[PDB]
Nucleic acid binder design. Structure first.
Length: 252
DNA sequence: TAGTCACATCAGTGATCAGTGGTAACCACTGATCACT
């Protein structure tokens, strides 16, 4: 499940653990048996697995290469969930528009998630945007469990309206009342900011009854536009399916 | 540098009971002085 971030997680975790295991065994901390005591490498994983089934919100490049591109699509939600609308704007000239949109939308008392690249201008935005009169919360690189479980509690208590985070946002931060999400200058190359994070934020906005993404780029890359195109076509398919399945949801 | 990434094991740390450390008659005596005839 969530293979798009599970298989890359397996690879990266194996790489990091084998690096630290070399740093241990070579520098006298553990035996090479501890190096053998490791998460499964992908070669031996393939050598050991049988009928392998993958499942994720997005088609992983490794899975697509392994399967040749032929997959099965079931991302359509009979429950009535659609992908978010997309607005693309330049990086500059956006703060006034954001303030106007949050003033117009705050009557619903929802939450808006924003992202940046590194810490300095991110925190500059945070203290400025708490200065001009909006309650804001931020995420850092060393977020512990309590400091955002309390964030979840106080957002279900409706104590603020906006969250900002760079990397501490893809792990279990589900919220039933997040409508608009802003992506700021993520077009630049990064080992931790390629297309999967943008599609993950798109899906996070999608899980709402009415999502929205505001995407700011100095330059346009093929990955983001292909992701937007596939998201839009999937949303069109979901809307077409839901137009026939007009029955209201009946949870059971 | 990303959320977890395997696996218990030492240190001297309060409060308090628990269970090692600290516990005048009798009138029996005999003598002195003495009340008595």
């Amino acid at each position: 499940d969530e293979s798009h971030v599970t298989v890359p997680q397996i690879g990266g975790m194996y790489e990091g653990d084998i690096s630290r295991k070399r740093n241990l065994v070579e520098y006298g901390f553990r035996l090479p048996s501890a190096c053998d005591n490791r998460p499964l490498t992908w070669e031996e994983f393939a050598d050991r697995i049988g009928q392998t089934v993958y499942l994720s919100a997005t088609p992983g490049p490794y899975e697509l290469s392994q399967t040749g591109g032929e997959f099965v699509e079931q991302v359509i939600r009979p429950t009535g969930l659609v992908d978010p609308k997309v607005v693309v704007k330049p990086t500059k000239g956006q703060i006034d528009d954001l303030i106007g949109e949050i003033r117009t939308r705050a009557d619903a008392d929802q939450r808006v998630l924003v992202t940046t690249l590194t810490k300095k201008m991110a925190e500059d935005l945070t203290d400025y945007l708490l200065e001009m009169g909006i309650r804001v919360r931020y995420l850092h690189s060393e977020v512990d469990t309590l400091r955002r479980v309390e964030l979840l509690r106080q957002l279900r208590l409706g104590d603020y309206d906006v969250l900002v985070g760079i990397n501490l946002l893809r792990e279990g931060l589900d919220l039933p009342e997040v409508s608009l999400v802003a992506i700021l200058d993520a077009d630049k190359e990064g080992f931790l900011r390629s297309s999967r994070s943008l599609i993950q934020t798109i899906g996070r906005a999608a899980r709402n009854v009415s999502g929205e993404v505001h995407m700011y780029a100095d330059k346009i890359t093929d990955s983001m536009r292909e992701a937007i195109d596939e998201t839009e076509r999937r949303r069109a398919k979901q809307i077409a399916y839901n137009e026939a399945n007009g029955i209201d949801p009946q949870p059971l």
